[PDB]
Design a protein around this ligand. Structure first.
Ligand SMILES: *[C@@H]1O[C@H](CO)[C@@H](O[C@@H]2O[C@H](CO)[C@@H](O[C@@H]3O[C@H](CO[C@H]4O[C@H](CO[C@H]5O[C@H](CO)[C@@H](O)[C@H](O)[C@@H]5O[C@H]5O[C@H](CO)[C@@H](O)[C@H](O)[C@@H]5O)[C@@H](O)[C@H](O[C@H]5O[C@H](CO)[C@@H](O)[C@H](O)[C@@H]5O)[C@@H]4O)[C@@H](O)[C@H](O[C@H]4O[C@H](CO)[C@@H](O)[C@H](O)[C@@H]4O[C@H]4O[C@H](CO)[C@@H](O)[C@H](O)[C@@H]4O[C@H]4O[C@H](CO)[C@@H](O)[C@H](O)[C@@H]4O)[C@@H]3O)[C@H](O)[C@H]2NC(C)=O)[C@H](O)[C@H]1NC(C)=O
Ligand SMILES: *[C@@H]1O[C@H](CO)[C@@H](O[C@@H]2O[C@H](CO)[C@@H](O[C@@H]3O[C@H](CO)[C@@H](O)[C@H](O)[C@H]3NC(C)=O)[C@H](O)[C@H]2NC(C)=O)[C@H](O)[C@H]1NC(C)=O
Ligand SMILES: *[C@@H]1O[C@H](CO)[C@@H](O[C@@H]2O[C@H](CO)[C@@H](O[C@@H]3O[C@H](CO)[C@@H](O)[C@H](O)[C@@H]3O)[C@H](O)[C@H]2NC(C)=O)[C@H](O)[C@H]1NC(C)=O
Ligand SMILES: *[C@@H]1O[C@H](CO)[C@@H](O[C@@H]2O[C@H](CO)[C@@H](O[C@@H]3O[C@H](CO)[C@@H](O)[C@H](O)[C@@H]3O)[C@H](O)[C@H]2NC(C)=O)[C@H](O)[C@H]1NC(C)=O
Ligand SMILES: *[C@@H]1O[C@H](CO)[C@@H](O[C@@H]2O[C@H](CO)[C@@H](O)[C@H](O)[C@H]2NC(C)=O)[C@H](O)[C@H]1NC(C)=O
Ligand SMILES: *[C@@H]1O[C@H](CO)[C@@H](O[C@@H]2O[C@H](CO)[C@@H](O)[C@H](O)[C@H]2NC(C)=O)[C@H](O)[C@H]1NC(C)=O
Ligand SMILES: *[C@@H]1O[C@H](CO)[C@@H](O[C@@H]2O[C@H](CO)[C@@H](O)[C@H](O)[C@H]2NC(C)=O)[C@H](O)[C@H]1NC(C)=O
Ligand SMILES: *[C@@H]1O[C@H](CO)[C@@H](O[C@@H]2O[C@H](CO)[C@@H](O)[C@H](O)[C@H]2NC(C)=O)[C@H](O)[C@H]1NC(C)=O
Ligand SMILES: *[C@@H]1O[C@H](CO)[C@@H](O[C@@H]2O[C@H](CO)[C@@H](O)[C@H](O)[C@H]2NC(C)=O)[C@H](O)[C@H]1NC(C)=O
Ligand code: NAG
Ligand code: NAG
Ligand code: NAG
Ligand code: NAG
Lengths: 226, 211, 294
């Protein structure tokens, strides 16, 4: 009933304010607690902070002096800021719904309980990269094919992560295989997707990929044919 | 942080011990998380699992202090190969900010799978830009470990190769790319290029020629 | 003592100190838990509350404070006269008198405010005093039906034995295994309320007039609390929630002391060693002792 979705800039210069948002679907925003979690390569899940339904803040001691978790009850938008960002702050950021639990072990009147939170519904995640290097759009080149055949497109030098590939704007979904990227020594990734398809339709039904690179707003699409 | 390696056989029951023992009455959370994937909540109370999570994920209720918190994954399959976290709350420790160290369950005994090598020649548009880049795509193999070797006619080449590390797919299998970058001159002057993929003790080769 | 607090009422401290050992020239840096009530600050360097007035002898951990019936007998050639009239006021003539050699089994139960484990009135809550018109004379109530008090110290304590000398072993309070809770007592509402309207209607037979119940006056802890013994440790329960009515449970928050003076003597205390495990005792409340103001 309730879904989430993060949003971000993809690239952030060092020593600048990072800003993300989230869109809550099918649920009131000032009804539950909201959290922020990030996972960097090499480090485990790190709990950033959380906001209450009363809109009160409480941040991790790891970054209490750099984080501001705001809110926007007009819609269902949850905010997050990161002052003075360094290279170690690049990670996949998540926003989840913290549900408050009340564990009582003694007498409720003597104060013999403790509050604990659990986050049951998470967002998809937003990738952010911290490097003073500039953004750059890709250069998708088509890969012509040759029981079945394989055909794809070589998304060459682009920075930074991520990139989206869709075949026939979402019509062709069976047999797709978007491979992981490759960080070249030149400092920018390169991706490649392919799709196994029956050899019958090599000439008739056109195959068109759709490449999306938001960190540079360079949206491209190309067609493949022998 | 630092990781704990775990290995169970396929079909067995995994008993994942929690990281930090509780000093008092506890309230433990179990998250199943994969690298580059949204973490899902398995058990939020000491044993209460939410909607959708199968009954094969069971925890230990804290009926009497002393009992340790463990996550029990009965009938492990290839999908239960992820990182598991133990969010340990109790009455004595402070605010449980960190999720603790991750235990990476690696289910053993999975069947072996052979690669699906596919090599594409440089595009006509790419060659027009005076830059040639072959691409060798390996897919649907297991275990996730291969070896690429590029052939320039007879003699091999390794200057200009950029190979992805294996990555788990949606079918619990692994895939990796392999890019050889060369000038358009040396693409036309060589008779053929090959992509030799060595998985386990076997090698398979899918070549391509400038034509 | 060098003490710090405990955990992120009942305050407990974790105190480290230098201590002697089996050999005179050598010392040991050992630590122990001390309840805040047994320890004062010097001005965080603390100090045992008794060291400035008297020494302390800790109880031999093999003896028990279990009150068991004592029979007081009279010598040969003497006698004991037992008044058997039920509604006997305690003073004056008694029409049903018999002679005995010894008294019945009397348990030396030390308590305050509430008289625990005792002899009941055969019918109607009987009240005893000297000069009722004089408020400085203590009134003694004796209930007819016993309300049951239910006490327990929940914290699972552990005993840590030091060695302060050749044969001298001071038993220190170890760690607290499990949760940290609050020691207290439970008595039944609508039963303390049922037996307080019984004491009420008998207090007005001597005082015409509305009667009020309040808390203790104030001062020492032993004077202003339901101090008693329970499993080995000495509780100090706050009975403001029991005497609070002018004519489901009612829980009394209790503190626990280790340095007790007992008989209010001229400088003599006893260190009650920590009882390992969980403590819980059940005691009848058969009597009372009030104090009028004027
Ligand atoms: C002297 O006088 C004293 C004062 O009068 C007196 O003190 C009393 O002491 C006792 C123990 O010494 C105390 O008992 C404790 O009480 C706790 C609270 O119990 C109540 O609440 C729970 C939970 O309620 C939430 O959940 C239910 C549904 O699950 C909802 O319906 C509720 O509305 C509520 O949920 C909402 O509210 C929350 C708060 O707003 C929100 O956050 C939430 O989102 C929701 O909105 C109820 O389940 C309890 O029901 C039980 O009792 C009723 C009678 O009232 C029974 O009929 C019924 O069958 C139930 O058994 C109750 O209403 C308890 O949590 C606590 O028990 C746990 O803790 C101890 C020690 O920590 C454990 O050893 C014990 O095993 C329990 O652990 C279980 O539960 C936790 C968390 O739930 C699990 O993590 C754990 O693994 C374990 O689960 C396992 O066992 C469960 C059954 O036990 C089972 O269901 C599970 O599936 C699993 O197998 C403990 O009992 C009592 O509070 C004191 N009194 C007061 C006033 O404080 C003293 O006794 C007197 N005598 C002396 C000193 O001698
Ligand atoms: C109020 O204080 C009580 C302490 O006396 C808490 O504990 C409950 O006391 C009841 C009274 O003895 C117990 O019920 C008894 O069980 C025995 C065993 O079968 C019977 O012989 C008794 O007749 C029966 N008494 C009654 C009145 O039913 C309860 O068992 C005991 N609680 C538990 C968990 O064992 C009360 O819990 C406490 N209540 C509150 C709300 O704090
Ligand atoms: C004083 O209070 C304590 C606790 O409030 C009372 O102890 C309780 O006694 C009952 C008696 O039946 C116990 O219930 C039984 O427990 C056993 C073991 O768990 C269980 O198998 C039975 O089915 C039944 O539930 C109860 O556990 C026990 N509670 C505790 C905390 O020890 C005691 O009876 C009271 N004394 C009085 C009122 O005189
Ligand atoms: C009022 O009387 C009751 C019962 O006569 C007293 O309860 C009794 O408490 C003692 C401990 O103080 C219990 O005896 C001992 O318990 C320990 C701990 O397990 C054990 O090591 C000993 O062997 C012995 O069993 C005793 O069982 C208990 N009686 C009952 C019936 O439960 C109560 O303490 C008295 N109150 C006061 C203020 O003296
Ligand atoms: C032993 O110490 C106690 C506790 O400090 C003394 O009682 C204190 O006396 C001083 C007098 O200067 C008061 O300021 C405190 O308020 C008293 N404390 C309490 C709790 O009443 C006691 O007098 C000391 N004994 C001797 C013989 O000096
Ligand atoms: C606490 O009071 C109860 C109730 O008066 C006592 O139980 C009685 O014990 C006598 C002596 O064996 C019996 O004749 C009664 O029948 C008992 N009454 C009930 C209701 O069982 C109990 O002995 C008292 N306990 C203490 C320690 O004083
Ligand atoms: C209080 O804590 C102690 C541990 O310090 C518990 O002692 C254990 O009790 C179990 C009972 O099943 C034994 O099997 C262990 O061997 C004991 N451990 C030690 C070190 O002796 C004790 O059970 C706790 N008390 C309660 C009431 O649970
Ligand atoms: C009281 O404080 C002392 C510190 O002096 C605690 O002793 C430490 O306990 C930890 C946990 O086992 C050990 O890692 C340290 O080595 C101990 N230090 C020393 C100097 O012994 C002691 O645990 C505390 N007591 C309680 C009940 O928490
Ligand atoms: C005993 O407990 C009562 C409450 O159960 C305490 O009452 C409080 O006392 C303070 C100090 O005078 C007042 O300011 C509060 O208004 C009282 N609260 C009430 C009556 O609910 C009392 O202080 C406790 N006494 C001891 C010695 O611990
Ligand atoms: C023990 O005594 C030494 C001096 O002899 C002192 O430096 C140290 O702090 C003492 N340790 C304690 C009191 O715990
Ligand atoms: C107690 O009752 C007797 C009855 O013989 C009476 O003489 C005496 O004055 C009474 N004393 C008190 C304090 O009630
Ligand atoms: C004296 O007490 C006994 C006790 O049973 C009773 O039988 C007798 O009737 C009493 N006598 C008087 C005069 O009260
Ligand atoms: C005394 O009684 C009043 C009225 O019932 C209540 O508000 C107050 O909390 C009671 N005090 C205590 C210490 O129980």
């Amino acid at each position: 009933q309730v879904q989430l979705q993060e949003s971000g800039p993809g690239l952030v210069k060092p020593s600048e304010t990072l800003s993300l948002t989230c869109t809550v679907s099918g649920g009131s925003i000032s009804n539950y607690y909201w959290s922020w979690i990030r996972q960097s390569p090499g480090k485990g899940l790190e709990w950033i902070g959380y906001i209450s339904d009363s809109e009160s803040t409480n941040y991790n001691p790891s970054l209490k002096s750099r984080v501001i978790i705001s809110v926007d009850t007009s819609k269902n938008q949850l905010s997050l800021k990161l002052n003075s960002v360094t290279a170690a702050d690049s990670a996949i950021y998540y926003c989840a719904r913290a549900q408050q639990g009340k564990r009582i072990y003694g007498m409720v009147s003597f104060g013999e309980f403790f509050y604990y939170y659990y986050m049951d519904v998470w967002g998809k995640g937003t990738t952010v990269t911290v490097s003073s290097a500039s953004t750059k759009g890709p250069s998708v080149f088509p890969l012509a094919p040759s029981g079945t055949a394989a055909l794809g497109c070589l998304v060459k030098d682009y920075f930074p992560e991520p990139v989206t590939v869709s075949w026939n704007s979402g019509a062709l979904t069976s047999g797709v295989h978007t491979f992981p990227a490759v960080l070249q020594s030149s400092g920018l990734y390169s991706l490649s997707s392919v799709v196994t398809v029956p050899s019958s339709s090599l000439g008739t039904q056109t195959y068109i990929c759709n490449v999306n690179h938001k960190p540079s707003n360079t949206k491209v699409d190309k067609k493949v044919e022998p | 942080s630092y990781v704990r390696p775990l290995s169970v056989a396929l079909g067995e029951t995994a008993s994942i011990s929690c990281g930090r023992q509780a000093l008092g009455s506890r309230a433990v959370q179990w998250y199943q998380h994969r690298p580059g994937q949204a973490p899902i909540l398995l058990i939020y109370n000491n044993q209460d699992r939410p909607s959708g999570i199968p009954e094969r994920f069971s925890g230990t209720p804290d009926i009497n202090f002393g009992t340790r918190a463990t996550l029990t994954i009965s009938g492990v399959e290839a999908g239960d190969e992820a990182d598991y976290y133990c969010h340990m709350w109790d009455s004595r420790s402070g605010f449980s900010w960190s999720f603790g160290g991750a235990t990476r369950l690696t289910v053993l005994g999975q069947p072996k799978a052979a690669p699906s090598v596919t090599l594409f020649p440089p595009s006509s548009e790419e060659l027009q830009a005076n830059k040639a880049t072959l691409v060798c795509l390996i897919s649907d193999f297991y275990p996730g470990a291969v070896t690429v070797a590029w052939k320039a006619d007879s003699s091999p080449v390794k200057a200009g190769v950029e190979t992805t590390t294996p990555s788990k797919q949606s079918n619990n299998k692994y895939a990796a790319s392999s890019y050889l970058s060369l000038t358009p001159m040396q693409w036309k002057m060589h008779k053929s290029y090959s992509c030799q993929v060595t998985h386990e003790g076997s090698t398979v080769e899918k070549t391509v020629a400038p034509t | 003592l060098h003490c710090t607090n405990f955990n992120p009422r009942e305050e407990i401290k974790n105190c480290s100190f230098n201590m002697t050992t089996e050999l005179r020239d050598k010392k040991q840096r050992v630590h122990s838990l001390f309840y805040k009530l047994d320890i004062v600050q010097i001005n965080s360097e603390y100090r045992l509350i008794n060291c400035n007035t008297s020494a302390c002898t800790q109880a031999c951990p093999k003896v028990s404070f279990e009150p068991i019936p004592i029979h007081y007998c009279a010598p040969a050639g003497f006698a004991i006269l037992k008044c058997k009239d039920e509604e006997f006021n305690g003073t004056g003539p008694c029409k049903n008198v018999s002679t005995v050699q010894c008294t019945h089994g009397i348990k030396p139960v030390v308590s305050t405010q509430l008289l625990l484990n005792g002899s009941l009135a055969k019918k109607e809550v009987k009240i005893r005093s000297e000069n009722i018109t004089n408020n400085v004379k203590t009134i003694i109530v004796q209930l007819v039906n016993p309300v049951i008090i239910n006490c327990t110290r929940p914290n699972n304590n552990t005993r840590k034995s030091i060695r302060i000398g050749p044969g001298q072993a001071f038993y220190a309070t170890g760690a607290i295994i499990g949760d940290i809770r609050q020691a207290h007592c439970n008595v039944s509402r609508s039963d303390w309320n049922k037996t307080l309207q019984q004491v009420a209607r008998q207090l007005r037979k001597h005082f015409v007039k509305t009667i009020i119940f309040t808390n203790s006056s104030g001062g020492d802890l032993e004077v202003t609390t339901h101090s008693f013994n329970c499993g080995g440790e000495f509780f100090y329960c706050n009975t403001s929630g029991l005497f609070n009515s002018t004519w489901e449970n009612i829980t009394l928050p209790c503190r626990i002391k280790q340095i007790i003076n007992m008989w209010q003597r001229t400088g003599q205390c006893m260190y009650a060693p920590p009882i390992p495990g969980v403590i819980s005792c059940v005691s009848n409340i058969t009597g009372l002792l009030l104090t009028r103001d004027g």
